[PDB]
Design a protein around this nucleic acid. Structure first.
Length: 144
RNA sequence: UAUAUAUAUAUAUAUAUAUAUAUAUAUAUAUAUAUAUAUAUAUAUAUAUAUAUAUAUAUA
């Protein structure tokens, strides 16, 4: 899409032309902000599940994750939480986080077909065998 | 009364000078616009040099 303003929503915003025309018409930080979009695209892959912060029409193949905790007050879309939750509630579309670990998805606890007794379910077994020599030998700000 | 000469005044004509007005041209100054050149600053691109990082190859 071709636009005449920076304040746009829904798609990555990049310059149509080389920077020489926009220079003077725009300033440094403004000219800087579009750089990732100037070469924006990256692929998306067809696995079993895909999480997303982008809302969508709740339906037979779309679910709302319920964590049973207060939202991020600073996160701009937290205001949508009530409307989304009630719509999911009235159609039984909430998913407790534990459901994600099962081989097949179902909203519920203590299902018949699964005893939910596996090392994957036991959160107490926190393990960190892998490594990448990364600068975060530990990130002491992240706490499980 | 007359003639001739000289001086002064007045009128008319012609020439020149000066002042004022109007038109035209040229020169100079000032302002504004446009173009070109040069200098300085900033941004972007390209080339070269130096430094640092990463990857790959070879040696120890």
């Amino acid at each position: 899409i071709y636009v005449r303003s920076t304040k746009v929503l829904g798609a990555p915003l990049c310059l149509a032309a080389p920077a020489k025309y926009y220079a003077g018409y725009l300033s440094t930080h403004q000219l800087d902000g579009v750089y990732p979009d100037n070469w924006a695209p990256d692929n998306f892959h067809k696995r079993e599940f895909c999480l997303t912060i982008l809302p969508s029409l709740l339906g037979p193949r779309t679910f709302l994750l319920d964590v049973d905790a207060d939202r991020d007050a600073s996160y701009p879309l937290s205001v949508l939480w009530p409307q989304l939750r009630v719509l999911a509630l009235k159609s039984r579309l909430l998913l407790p986080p534990v459901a994600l670990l099962r081989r097949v998805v179902d909203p519920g606890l203590k299902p018949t077909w699964s005893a939910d007794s596996d090392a994957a379910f036991r959160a107490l077994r926190l393990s960190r065998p892998s490594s990448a020599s990364k600068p975060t030998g530990f990130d002491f700000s992240a706490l499980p």
